[PDB]
Amino acid sequence: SEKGPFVQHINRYLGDDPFLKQFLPLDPHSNQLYELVKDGVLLCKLINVAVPGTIDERAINTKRVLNPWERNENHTLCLNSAKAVGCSVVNIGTQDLAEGRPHLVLGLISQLIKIQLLADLNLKKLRLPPEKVLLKWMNFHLKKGGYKKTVSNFSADLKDAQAYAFLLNVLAPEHCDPATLDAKDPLERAELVLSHAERMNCKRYLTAEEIVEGSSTLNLAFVAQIFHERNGLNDVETCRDERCYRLWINSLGIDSYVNNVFEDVRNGWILLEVLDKVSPSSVNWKHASKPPIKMPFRKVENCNQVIKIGKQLKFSLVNVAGNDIVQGNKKLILGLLWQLMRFHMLQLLKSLRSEMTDADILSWANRKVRTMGRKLQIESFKDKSLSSGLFFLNLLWAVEPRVVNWNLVTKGETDDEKRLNATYIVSVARKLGCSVFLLPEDIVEVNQKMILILTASIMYWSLQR
Protein backbone atom coordinates (compact mmCIF):
# COMPACT_ATOMS: atom_id res chain seq x y z
CA SER A 1 0.00 0.00 0.00
CA GLU A 2 3.10 2.18 0.34
CA LYS A 3 3.71 1.88 -3.40
CA GLY A 4 1.98 5.20 -4.05
CA PRO A 5 3.99 7.46 -1.71
CA PHE A 6 7.15 5.57 -2.69
CA VAL A 7 6.58 6.52 -6.33
CA GLN A 8 5.68 10.14 -5.61
CA HIS A 9 8.88 10.30 -3.56
CA ILE A 10 10.96 9.13 -6.53
CA ASN A 11 9.19 11.44 -8.99
CA ARG A 12 9.83 14.44 -6.74
CA TYR A 13 13.49 13.83 -5.91
CA LEU A 14 14.59 12.33 -9.24
CA GLY A 15 12.18 14.06 -11.63
CA ASP A 16 14.92 16.40 -12.84
CA ASP A 17 17.73 13.84 -13.03
CA PRO A 18 19.54 14.29 -16.40
CA PHE A 19 19.09 10.58 -17.16
CA LEU A 20 15.77 9.73 -15.51
CA LYS A 21 14.35 13.11 -16.54
CA GLN A 22 12.56 11.46 -19.46
CA PHE A 23 11.15 8.41 -17.65
CA LEU A 24 9.51 10.51 -14.94
CA PRO A 25 7.02 11.12 -13.56
CA LEU A 26 5.80 7.56 -12.98
CA ASP A 27 2.18 6.52 -12.45
CA PRO A 28 1.89 5.25 -8.83
CA HIS A 29 -1.09 3.17 -9.97
CA SER A 30 0.75 1.34 -12.75
CA ASN A 31 3.72 -1.03 -12.50
CA GLN A 32 6.19 1.29 -14.24
CA LEU A 33 8.16 1.30 -10.98
CA TYR A 34 9.12 -2.37 -11.10
CA GLU A 35 10.16 -1.86 -14.72
CA LEU A 36 12.39 1.20 -14.23
CA VAL A 37 14.30 -0.74 -11.57
CA LYS A 38 15.36 -3.64 -13.80
CA ASP A 39 18.42 -1.91 -15.29
CA GLY A 40 19.86 -0.76 -11.96
CA VAL A 41 20.22 2.97 -12.63
CA LEU A 42 17.15 4.07 -10.68
CA LEU A 43 18.05 2.52 -7.32
CA CYS A 44 21.71 3.55 -7.57
CA LYS A 45 20.59 7.16 -7.98
CA LEU A 46 17.99 6.84 -5.20
CA ILE A 47 20.82 5.87 -2.86
CA ASN A 48 22.66 9.14 -3.55
CA VAL A 49 19.37 10.90 -2.86
CA ALA A 50 19.27 9.21 0.55
CA VAL A 51 22.97 9.76 1.26
CA PRO A 52 24.69 12.12 -1.23
CA GLY A 53 28.16 11.13 -2.43
CA THR A 54 27.69 7.43 -1.74
CA ILE A 55 28.04 6.21 -5.32
CA ASP A 56 30.23 7.85 -7.96
CA GLU A 57 27.58 8.00 -10.69
CA ARG A 58 30.38 7.73 -13.25
CA ALA A 59 30.72 4.06 -12.29
CA ILE A 60 27.08 3.38 -13.20
CA ASN A 61 26.38 1.83 -16.61
CA THR A 62 24.07 4.54 -17.97
CA LYS A 63 23.40 3.49 -21.57
CA ARG A 64 20.14 3.35 -23.53
CA VAL A 65 20.45 -0.41 -23.89
CA LEU A 66 22.32 -2.62 -21.41
CA ASN A 67 23.81 -6.10 -21.68
CA PRO A 68 22.85 -8.74 -19.10
CA TRP A 69 26.19 -7.93 -17.48
CA GLU A 70 26.20 -4.14 -17.61
CA ARG A 71 22.85 -4.63 -15.91
CA ASN A 72 24.22 -7.03 -13.28
CA GLU A 73 26.95 -4.54 -12.39
CA ASN A 74 24.50 -1.76 -11.51
CA HIS A 75 22.61 -4.09 -9.16
CA THR A 76 25.89 -5.24 -7.64
CA LEU A 77 27.05 -1.67 -7.17
CA CYS A 78 23.56 -0.89 -5.85
CA LEU A 79 23.29 -3.65 -3.24
CA ASN A 80 26.83 -3.06 -1.96
CA SER A 81 26.18 0.67 -1.72
CA ALA A 82 22.93 0.04 0.16
CA LYS A 83 24.89 -1.72 2.90
CA ALA A 84 27.32 1.20 3.04
CA VAL A 85 24.43 3.45 4.06
CA GLY A 86 22.86 1.09 6.60
CA CYS A 87 20.40 -0.94 4.53
CA SER A 88 19.52 -4.54 5.33
CA VAL A 89 19.79 -6.33 1.98
CA VAL A 90 21.19 -9.64 3.25
CA ASN A 91 18.29 -11.48 1.58
CA ILE A 92 18.02 -9.48 -1.67
CA GLY A 93 19.87 -10.96 -4.63
CA THR A 94 21.14 -9.24 -7.77
CA GLN A 95 18.58 -11.15 -9.84
CA ASP A 96 15.68 -10.08 -7.62
CA LEU A 97 16.29 -6.48 -8.71
CA ALA A 98 16.63 -7.40 -12.38
CA GLU A 99 13.29 -9.21 -12.28
CA GLY A 100 11.84 -6.56 -9.99
CA ARG A 101 10.29 -8.40 -7.05
CA PRO A 102 7.93 -5.93 -5.29
CA HIS A 103 8.20 -7.21 -1.71
CA LEU A 104 11.97 -6.75 -2.06
CA VAL A 105 11.98 -3.55 -4.10
CA LEU A 106 9.52 -1.71 -1.87
CA GLY A 107 11.26 -3.10 1.20
CA LEU A 108 14.58 -1.73 -0.05
CA ILE A 109 13.20 1.66 -1.08
CA SER A 110 11.44 1.84 2.29
CA GLN A 111 14.79 1.67 4.10
CA LEU A 112 16.35 4.28 1.82
CA ILE A 113 13.53 6.78 2.36
CA LYS A 114 13.93 6.21 6.10
CA ILE A 115 17.68 6.81 5.86
CA GLN A 116 17.12 9.87 3.65
CA LEU A 117 14.57 11.54 5.92
CA LEU A 118 15.91 10.57 9.35
CA ALA A 119 19.68 10.84 8.89
CA ASP A 120 21.66 14.03 9.57
CA LEU A 121 19.75 14.22 12.85
CA ASN A 122 22.79 13.09 14.86
CA LEU A 123 25.41 15.03 12.88
CA LYS A 124 23.85 18.47 12.91
CA LYS A 125 24.75 21.48 15.07
CA LEU A 126 22.33 12.81 22.43
CA ARG A 127 20.78 9.44 23.21
CA LEU A 128 17.50 10.34 21.50
CA PRO A 129 16.29 8.49 18.40
CA PRO A 130 16.12 10.55 15.16
CA GLU A 131 12.34 10.85 15.50
CA LYS A 132 12.55 12.34 18.99
CA VAL A 133 15.34 14.68 17.87
CA LEU A 134 13.02 16.00 15.17
CA LEU A 135 10.36 16.57 17.84
CA LYS A 136 12.77 18.69 19.88
CA TRP A 137 13.66 20.73 16.80
CA MET A 138 10.00 21.37 16.02
CA ASN A 139 9.01 22.31 19.58
CA PHE A 140 12.06 24.59 19.68
CA HIS A 141 10.66 26.86 16.96
CA LEU A 142 7.09 26.46 18.19
CA LYS A 143 8.07 27.88 21.60
CA LYS A 144 9.31 31.12 20.07
CA GLY A 145 6.29 30.98 17.79
CA GLY A 146 4.05 31.41 20.81
CA TYR A 147 2.59 27.94 20.31
CA LYS A 148 1.01 26.72 23.56
CA LYS A 149 0.69 22.95 23.09
CA THR A 150 3.66 20.58 23.01
CA VAL A 151 4.28 18.05 20.24
CA SER A 152 5.08 14.48 21.32
CA ASN A 153 3.79 12.39 18.40
CA PHE A 154 3.23 12.62 14.63
CA SER A 155 -0.43 11.60 14.51
CA ALA A 156 -2.87 13.25 16.94
CA ASP A 157 -0.58 16.19 17.72
CA LEU A 158 -0.68 17.18 14.03
CA LYS A 159 -4.17 16.17 12.87
CA ASP A 160 -5.44 19.77 12.96
CA ALA A 161 -2.53 21.32 11.02
CA GLN A 162 -2.19 23.97 13.76
CA ALA A 163 1.40 23.05 14.67
CA TYR A 164 2.29 22.92 10.97
CA ALA A 165 0.98 26.43 10.32
CA PHE A 166 2.89 27.91 13.26
CA LEU A 167 6.14 26.13 12.38
CA LEU A 168 6.00 27.20 8.74
CA ASN A 169 5.27 30.81 9.75
CA VAL A 170 8.36 30.66 11.95
CA LEU A 171 10.68 29.18 9.31
CA ALA A 172 9.23 30.87 6.21
CA PRO A 173 7.25 34.00 7.23
CA GLU A 174 7.70 35.57 3.79
CA HIS A 175 5.38 32.85 2.45
CA CYS A 176 2.65 33.32 5.05
CA ASP A 177 -1.00 33.24 3.95
CA PRO A 178 -3.37 35.02 6.37
CA ALA A 179 -6.11 32.78 4.97
CA THR A 180 -5.08 29.95 7.30
CA LEU A 181 -6.41 32.09 10.14
CA ASP A 182 -9.86 32.03 8.53
CA ALA A 183 -9.66 28.25 8.14
CA LYS A 184 -12.54 26.76 10.12
CA ASP A 185 -12.12 23.14 9.05
CA PRO A 186 -8.85 21.28 9.78
CA LEU A 187 -8.80 20.02 6.19
CA GLU A 188 -8.84 23.58 4.86
CA ARG A 189 -5.99 24.46 7.20
CA ALA A 190 -4.03 21.44 5.95
CA GLU A 191 -4.42 22.33 2.26
CA LEU A 192 -3.04 25.82 3.03
CA VAL A 193 -0.22 24.30 5.09
CA LEU A 194 0.75 22.13 2.12
CA SER A 195 0.78 25.24 -0.06
CA HIS A 196 2.99 27.18 2.34
CA ALA A 197 5.41 24.24 2.29
CA GLU A 198 5.28 24.14 -1.52
CA ARG A 199 6.23 27.83 -1.64
CA MET A 200 9.40 27.25 0.37
CA ASN A 201 10.23 24.48 -2.10
CA CYS A 202 9.77 21.37 0.05
CA LYS A 203 9.40 18.28 -2.10
CA ARG A 204 6.29 17.45 -0.10
CA TYR A 205 3.92 14.89 -1.63
CA LEU A 206 1.35 13.95 1.04
CA THR A 207 -2.25 15.16 0.75
CA ALA A 208 -4.45 17.29 3.01
CA GLU A 209 -6.42 14.18 3.91
CA GLU A 210 -3.28 12.34 4.99
CA ILE A 211 -2.62 15.13 7.49
CA VAL A 212 -6.06 15.25 9.11
CA GLU A 213 -6.28 11.45 9.32
CA GLY A 214 -3.14 11.65 11.45
CA SER A 215 -1.11 9.20 9.36
CA SER A 216 1.97 8.77 11.57
CA THR A 217 4.34 7.55 8.86
CA LEU A 218 3.37 10.16 6.26
CA ASN A 219 3.38 13.11 8.66
CA LEU A 220 6.75 12.16 10.16
CA ALA A 221 8.23 12.34 6.67
CA PHE A 222 6.69 15.78 6.05
CA VAL A 223 8.15 17.21 9.27
CA ALA A 224 11.55 15.83 8.25
CA GLN A 225 11.16 17.38 4.79
CA ILE A 226 10.47 20.76 6.39
CA PHE A 227 13.61 20.36 8.50
CA HIS A 228 15.84 19.43 5.56
CA GLU A 229 14.62 22.47 3.64
CA ARG A 230 14.99 24.93 6.54
CA ASN A 231 16.22 23.95 10.00
CA GLY A 232 16.02 27.58 11.08
CA LEU A 233 19.25 27.34 13.03
CA ASN A 234 21.87 30.08 13.21
CA ASP A 235 39.76 11.04 18.62
CA VAL A 236 37.90 11.44 15.33
CA GLU A 237 39.12 8.01 14.23
CA THR A 238 36.89 6.53 16.93
CA CYS A 239 33.84 7.94 15.16
CA ARG A 240 34.98 6.50 11.83
CA ASP A 241 35.68 3.05 13.26
CA GLU A 242 32.29 3.16 14.97
CA ARG A 243 30.63 3.59 11.57
CA CYS A 244 32.88 1.06 9.82
CA TYR A 245 32.37 -1.92 12.14
CA ARG A 246 28.71 -1.04 12.57
CA LEU A 247 28.16 -1.33 8.82
CA TRP A 248 30.27 -4.49 8.62
CA ILE A 249 28.37 -6.26 11.42
CA ASN A 250 25.01 -5.39 9.85
CA SER A 251 26.00 -7.06 6.56
CA LEU A 252 27.18 -10.35 8.07
CA GLY A 253 23.70 -11.87 8.16
CA ILE A 254 23.46 -11.43 11.93
CA ASP A 255 20.02 -11.54 13.59
CA SER A 256 20.58 -8.35 15.59
CA TYR A 257 20.88 -4.85 14.15
CA VAL A 258 23.56 -2.41 15.31
CA ASN A 259 22.69 1.27 15.69
CA ASN A 260 25.80 2.01 17.78
CA VAL A 261 28.60 -0.54 18.20
CA PHE A 262 29.88 0.97 21.45
CA GLU A 263 26.48 0.68 23.14
CA ASP A 264 24.75 -2.27 21.47
CA VAL A 265 27.73 -4.55 22.09
CA ARG A 266 27.84 -4.24 25.90
CA ASN A 267 25.59 -7.18 26.79
CA GLY A 268 27.79 -9.53 24.77
CA TRP A 269 25.09 -11.08 22.58
CA ILE A 270 25.92 -9.42 19.25
CA LEU A 271 29.61 -10.25 19.62
CA LEU A 272 28.71 -13.89 20.14
CA GLU A 273 26.67 -13.80 16.93
CA VAL A 274 29.56 -12.33 14.94
CA LEU A 275 31.82 -15.03 16.39
CA ASP A 276 29.42 -17.80 15.38
CA LYS A 277 29.34 -16.43 11.82
CA VAL A 278 33.07 -15.85 11.37
CA SER A 279 33.93 -19.12 13.15
CA PRO A 280 30.97 -21.58 12.85
CA SER A 281 30.07 -23.67 15.91
CA SER A 282 32.57 -21.75 18.04
CA VAL A 283 29.90 -20.40 20.39
CA ASN A 284 28.19 -22.50 23.06
CA TRP A 285 24.70 -21.00 23.27
CA LYS A 286 23.83 -23.25 26.20
CA HIS A 287 25.94 -20.88 28.33
CA ALA A 288 24.71 -17.63 26.79
CA SER A 289 21.72 -15.44 27.60
CA LYS A 290 19.54 -13.84 24.92
CA PRO A 291 18.41 -10.20 25.38
CA PRO A 292 16.65 -8.30 26.73
CA ILE A 293 18.93 -8.77 29.74
CA LYS A 294 18.30 -7.25 33.16
CA MET A 295 20.48 -9.50 35.28
CA PRO A 296 24.10 -8.24 35.14
CA PHE A 297 25.46 -11.75 35.71
CA ARG A 298 24.14 -12.83 32.33
CA LYS A 299 25.87 -9.88 30.66
CA VAL A 300 29.27 -10.62 32.17
CA GLU A 301 28.92 -14.30 31.29
CA ASN A 302 28.26 -13.59 27.61
CA CYS A 303 31.23 -11.23 27.36
CA ASN A 304 33.56 -13.69 29.09
CA GLN A 305 32.76 -16.34 26.47
CA VAL A 306 33.45 -13.68 23.86
CA ILE A 307 36.89 -13.12 25.35
CA LYS A 308 37.56 -16.84 25.73
CA ILE A 309 36.78 -17.66 22.09
CA GLY A 310 38.81 -14.61 21.12
CA LYS A 311 41.91 -15.88 22.89
CA GLN A 312 41.29 -19.36 21.50
CA LEU A 313 41.44 -17.86 18.00
CA LYS A 314 44.88 -16.55 19.00
CA PHE A 315 43.69 -12.93 19.13
CA SER A 316 45.59 -10.43 21.27
CA LEU A 317 43.70 -9.53 24.45
CA VAL A 318 45.81 -8.46 27.43
CA ASN A 319 44.64 -7.17 30.80
CA VAL A 320 41.00 -7.47 29.79
CA ALA A 321 37.99 -9.65 30.51
CA GLY A 322 34.26 -9.81 29.92
CA ASN A 323 33.39 -6.90 32.19
CA ASP A 324 35.55 -4.67 29.97
CA ILE A 325 33.03 -5.09 27.15
CA VAL A 326 30.14 -4.50 29.56
CA GLN A 327 31.84 -1.31 30.78
CA GLY A 328 32.13 -0.15 27.19
CA ASN A 329 35.93 -0.21 26.88
CA LYS A 330 36.05 1.34 23.40
CA LYS A 331 39.74 0.58 22.93
CA LEU A 332 39.08 -3.13 23.54
CA ILE A 333 35.86 -3.21 21.52
CA LEU A 334 37.55 -1.66 18.48
CA GLY A 335 40.54 -3.97 18.86
CA LEU A 336 38.36 -7.06 19.11
CA LEU A 337 36.28 -5.98 16.12
CA TRP A 338 39.30 -5.30 13.90
CA GLN A 339 40.75 -8.74 14.58
CA LEU A 340 37.32 -10.25 13.91
CA MET A 341 37.14 -8.43 10.57
CA ARG A 342 40.68 -9.45 9.60
CA PHE A 343 40.07 -13.02 10.77
CA HIS A 344 36.95 -13.39 8.64
CA MET A 345 38.70 -11.93 5.60
CA LEU A 346 41.64 -14.33 5.84
CA GLN A 347 39.33 -17.29 6.38
CA LEU A 348 37.33 -16.36 3.28
CA LEU A 349 40.46 -16.16 1.13
CA LYS A 350 41.66 -19.44 2.61
CA SER A 351 38.46 -21.20 1.53
CA LEU A 352 39.49 -20.50 -2.07
CA ARG A 353 42.49 -22.82 -1.79
CA SER A 354 42.77 -26.17 -3.59
CA GLU A 355 47.53 -20.07 6.92
CA MET A 356 46.98 -16.73 5.16
CA THR A 357 48.94 -13.63 6.15
CA ASP A 358 48.85 -9.91 5.42
CA ALA A 359 52.08 -10.43 3.47
CA ASP A 360 50.47 -12.98 1.14
CA ILE A 361 47.88 -10.35 0.24
CA LEU A 362 50.58 -7.73 -0.31
CA SER A 363 52.40 -10.19 -2.58
CA TRP A 364 49.25 -11.01 -4.56
CA ALA A 365 48.43 -7.36 -5.26
CA ASN A 366 51.93 -6.47 -6.45
CA ARG A 367 52.15 -9.63 -8.54
CA LYS A 368 48.68 -9.12 -10.02
CA VAL A 369 49.60 -5.65 -11.28
CA ARG A 370 52.85 -6.90 -12.83
CA THR A 371 50.84 -9.19 -15.12
CA MET A 372 49.42 -6.16 -16.92
CA GLY A 373 52.87 -4.86 -17.76
CA ARG A 374 52.86 -2.10 -15.15
CA LYS A 375 55.83 -1.62 -12.82
CA LEU A 376 54.24 0.31 -9.93
CA GLN A 377 54.36 -1.65 -6.67
CA ILE A 378 53.99 -1.04 -2.94
CA GLU A 379 56.23 -1.95 -0.01
CA SER A 380 53.29 -2.27 2.39
CA PHE A 381 49.67 -1.30 2.99
CA LYS A 382 51.01 1.80 4.74
CA ASP A 383 52.88 2.94 1.63
CA LYS A 384 52.45 6.72 1.30
CA SER A 385 52.10 6.60 -2.49
CA LEU A 386 48.79 4.78 -2.01
CA SER A 387 47.04 8.12 -1.41
CA SER A 388 47.16 8.87 -5.15
CA GLY A 389 44.82 5.97 -5.83
CA LEU A 390 46.77 4.99 -8.93
CA PHE A 391 47.83 1.61 -7.57
CA PHE A 392 44.29 0.51 -6.68
CA LEU A 393 42.94 1.61 -10.07
CA ASN A 394 45.69 -0.36 -11.79
CA LEU A 395 44.98 -3.42 -9.62
CA LEU A 396 41.25 -3.13 -10.32
CA TRP A 397 42.02 -2.65 -14.00
CA ALA A 398 44.24 -5.74 -13.82
CA VAL A 399 41.40 -7.75 -12.27
CA GLU A 400 38.74 -6.54 -14.72
CA PRO A 401 39.77 -3.84 -17.25
CA ARG A 402 36.10 -3.43 -18.20
CA VAL A 403 35.27 -1.77 -14.85
CA VAL A 404 37.88 0.99 -14.98
CA ASN A 405 37.47 3.90 -17.39
CA TRP A 406 40.81 5.71 -17.41
CA ASN A 407 39.40 8.88 -18.95
CA LEU A 408 37.68 9.26 -15.57
CA VAL A 409 40.81 8.72 -13.49
CA THR A 410 43.02 11.61 -12.41
CA LYS A 411 46.57 12.03 -11.13
CA GLY A 412 47.04 11.48 -7.41
CA GLU A 413 48.52 14.90 -6.75
CA THR A 414 46.13 17.51 -5.34
CA ASP A 415 43.93 16.63 -2.37
CA ASP A 416 40.98 17.10 -4.72
CA GLU A 417 42.35 14.74 -7.38
CA LYS A 418 43.04 12.07 -4.76
CA ARG A 419 39.60 12.50 -3.24
CA LEU A 420 38.14 11.95 -6.70
CA ASN A 421 40.00 8.71 -7.43
CA ALA A 422 39.30 7.38 -3.93
CA THR A 423 35.54 7.80 -4.34
CA TYR A 424 35.85 6.19 -7.77
CA ILE A 425 37.86 3.29 -6.33
CA VAL A 426 35.28 2.57 -3.62
CA SER A 427 32.45 2.46 -6.16
CA VAL A 428 34.29 0.35 -8.75
CA ALA A 429 35.30 -2.15 -6.07
CA ARG A 430 31.66 -2.48 -4.98
CA LYS A 431 30.74 -2.82 -8.64
CA LEU A 432 32.94 -5.94 -8.70
CA GLY A 433 31.38 -7.39 -5.57
CA CYS A 434 33.61 -6.06 -2.80
CA SER A 435 31.55 -5.49 0.33
CA VAL A 436 33.85 -2.84 1.83
CA PHE A 437 33.03 0.03 4.18
CA LEU A 438 36.09 2.27 4.24
CA LEU A 439 35.61 5.96 3.40
CA PRO A 440 37.26 7.59 0.36
CA GLU A 441 39.45 9.52 2.80
CA ASP A 442 40.67 6.17 4.14
CA ILE A 443 42.67 5.86 0.91
CA VAL A 444 43.78 9.50 0.77
CA GLU A 445 45.08 9.31 4.34
CA VAL A 446 46.31 5.73 3.88
CA ASN A 447 44.58 3.86 6.73
CA GLN A 448 46.65 0.66 6.49
CA LYS A 449 44.05 -1.53 8.20
CA MET A 450 41.36 -0.41 5.74
CA ILE A 451 43.83 -0.69 2.87
CA LEU A 452 44.54 -4.32 3.77
CA ILE A 453 40.86 -5.29 3.80
CA LEU A 454 40.02 -3.54 0.51
CA THR A 455 42.90 -5.29 -1.25
CA ALA A 456 42.05 -8.65 0.32
CA SER A 457 38.47 -8.11 -0.82
CA ILE A 458 39.58 -7.34 -4.39
CA MET A 459 41.67 -10.51 -4.24
CA TYR A 460 38.73 -12.52 -2.93
CA TRP A 461 36.63 -11.77 -6.02
CA SER A 462 39.55 -11.90 -8.44
CA LEU A 463 40.32 -15.51 -7.51
CA GLN A 464 36.76 -16.47 -8.47
CA ARG A 465 36.69 -14.97 -11.97
Side-chain angles (χ1 to χ4, degrees), residues 1-353 355-465:
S1 185
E2 294 181 299
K3 174 190 170 187
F6 280 31
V7 172
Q8 295 304 309
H9 187 285
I10 293 181
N11 293 168
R12 285 287 255 178
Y13 290 88
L14 293 170
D16 289 359
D17 180 65
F19 179 72
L20 303 174
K21 190 177 305 180
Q22 62 178 298
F23 307 86
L24 306 181
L26 293 171
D27 172 56
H29 300 304
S30 60
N31 295 299
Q32 303 181 301
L33 177 67
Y34 307 115
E35 291 298 308
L36 191 64
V37 62
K38 296 184 177 179
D39 279 54
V41 180
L42 185 279
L43 298 183
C44 279
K45 285 177 172 297
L46 207 194
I47 290 179
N48 280 313
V49 174
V51 178
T54 298
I55 303 174
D56 184 345
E57 310 219 310
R58 297 185 299 178
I60 304 177
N61 302 313
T62 57
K63 294 184 178 181
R64 252 73 178 190
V65 295
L66 295 175
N67 310 305
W69 302 93
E70 296 178 295
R71 181 191 308 296
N72 190 71
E73 296 188 303
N74 292 326
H75 297 304
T76 305
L77 171 58
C78 171
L79 280 44
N80 281 310
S81 296
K83 307 172 187 178
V85 298
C87 290
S88 188
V89 63
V90 191
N91 54 305
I92 307 177
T94 181
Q95 244 54 293
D96 295 303
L97 290 303
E99 304 183 305
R101 298 200 173 188
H103 79 86
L104 289 183
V105 177
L106 296 175
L108 178 57
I109 295 180
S110 180
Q111 301 175 63
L112 291 173
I113 304 299
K114 189 77 164 180
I115 298 296
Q116 170 177 172
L117 273 35
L118 299 182
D120 293 43
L121 264 52
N122 305 63
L123 299 170
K124 60 185 176 179
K125 43 185 176 181
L126 183 57
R127 64 176 182 180
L128 286 174
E131 295 176 49
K132 307 312 167 182
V133 178
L134 188 60
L135 285 180
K136 165 137 293 185
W137 168 77
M138 177 169 231
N139 284 151
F140 174 59
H141 295 293
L142 295 174
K143 298 175 181 181
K144 306 189 173 187
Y147 194 57
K148 280 63 178 60
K149 301 184 182 180
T150 302
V151 184
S152 58
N153 61 75
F154 302 80
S155 56
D157 284 36
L158 303 177
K159 298 196 307 174
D160 65 3
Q162 290 286 52
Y164 278 138
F166 276 68
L167 177 63
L168 292 174
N169 275 330
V170 169
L171 304 172
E174 71 283 2
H175 290 146
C176 175
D177 187 333
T180 68
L181 186 64
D182 299 307
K184 307 174 181 178
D185 194 65
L187 180 71
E188 181 182 1
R189 190 175 304 96
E191 187 63 37
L192 286 171
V193 157
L194 298 173
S195 298
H196 193 149
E198 187 65 36
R199 277 181 172 176
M200 52 189 283
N201 307 302
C202 293
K203 294 181 180 179
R204 151 253 69 177
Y205 52 83
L206 78 173
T207 68
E209 190 174 9
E210 295 169 354
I211 289 184
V212 300
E213 292 298 61
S215 177
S216 174
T217 182
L218 290 175
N219 282 78
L220 166 59
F222 184 40
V223 181
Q225 290 184 300
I226 307 291
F227 174 73
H228 293 300
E229 188 61 12
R230 293 195 191 185
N231 50 240
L233 300 176
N234 187 210
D235 66 298
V236 66
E237 303 93 66
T238 302
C239 179
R240 293 180 179 182
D241 294 318
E242 188 289 330
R243 185 192 78 98
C244 176
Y245 296 118
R246 188 181 89 230
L247 297 172
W248 176 64
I249 299 173
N250 285 168
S251 65
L252 296 176
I254 178 181
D255 286 311
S256 303
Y257 187 87
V258 179
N259 298 299
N260 182 300
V261 300
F262 290 142
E263 280 304 306
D264 304 352
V265 85
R266 306 179 69 175
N267 68 35
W269 189 256
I270 294 181
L271 284 178
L272 282 177
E273 301 198 74
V274 175
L275 282 169
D276 217 27
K277 286 289 184 174
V278 180
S279 181
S281 304
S282 67
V283 178
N284 176 171
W285 305 97
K286 193 176 181 189
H287 294 304
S289 303
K290 168 175 159 297
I293 305 180
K294 170 186 173 55
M295 306 303 283
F297 169 68
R298 286 183 151 63
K299 291 185 176 186
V300 176
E301 205 190 17
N302 288 346
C303 295
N304 271 154
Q305 204 192 316
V306 171
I307 295 302
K308 185 216 281 194
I309 305 179
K311 292 193 179 186
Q312 278 176 158
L313 296 173
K314 316 308 177 183
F315 287 176
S316 180
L317 298 306
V318 295
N319 305 308
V320 293
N323 50 331
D324 282 292
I325 300 175
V326 177
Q327 299 190 326
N329 189 314
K330 305 184 184 181
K331 193 163 296 179
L332 161 66
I333 292 180
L334 297 178
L336 177 61
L337 285 169
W338 163 237
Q339 284 176 282
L340 283 170
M341 181 180 259
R342 169 169 176 291
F343 183 83
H344 191 206
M345 190 69 263
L346 297 182
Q347 289 293 289
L348 286 174
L349 286 174
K350 189 179 181 178
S351 67
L352 273 46
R353 292 177 167 183
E355 42 186 294
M356 292 296 288
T357 63
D358 300 358
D360 296 325
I361 304 176
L362 189 291
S363 175
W364 176 84
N366 282 310
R367 182 171 57 243
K368 180 63 174 182
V369 176
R370 273 188 280 95
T371 72
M372 292 300 270
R374 301 309 304 287
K375 290 288 188 176
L376 65 165
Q377 305 271 286
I378 58 180
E379 290 182 55
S380 60
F381 294 118
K382 177 194 174 185
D383 202 338
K384 314 162 187 173
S385 62
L386 284 170
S387 57
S388 75
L390 295 177
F391 184 71
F392 278 117
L393 289 169
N394 269 282
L395 180 62
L396 282 174
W397 176 66
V399 172
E400 185 67 290
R402 308 176 73 173
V403 300
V404 178
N405 188 150
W406 293 91
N407 277 340
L408 307 183
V409 182
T410 75
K411 285 179 167 293
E413 302 185 303
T414 75
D415 300 301
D416 299 67
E417 295 182 305
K418 295 183 174 182
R419 223 291 179 175
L420 192 55
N421 292 344
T423 302
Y424 185 51
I425 288 174
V426 173
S427 291
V428 179
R430 285 172 183 164
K431 188 177 181 175
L432 279 183
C434 307
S435 181
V436 287
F437 308 95
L438 71 172
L439 296 171
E441 31 275 299
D442 280 335
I443 300 175
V444 182
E445 304 172 1
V446 187
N447 180 172
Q448 70 174 301
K449 280 182 170 58
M450 293 299 96
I451 294 302
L452 195 183
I453 304 293
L454 209 195
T455 308
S457 186
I458 304 297
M459 189 186 301
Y460 183 65
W461 295 104
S462 180
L463 295 173
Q464 292 174 289
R465 302 293 174 175

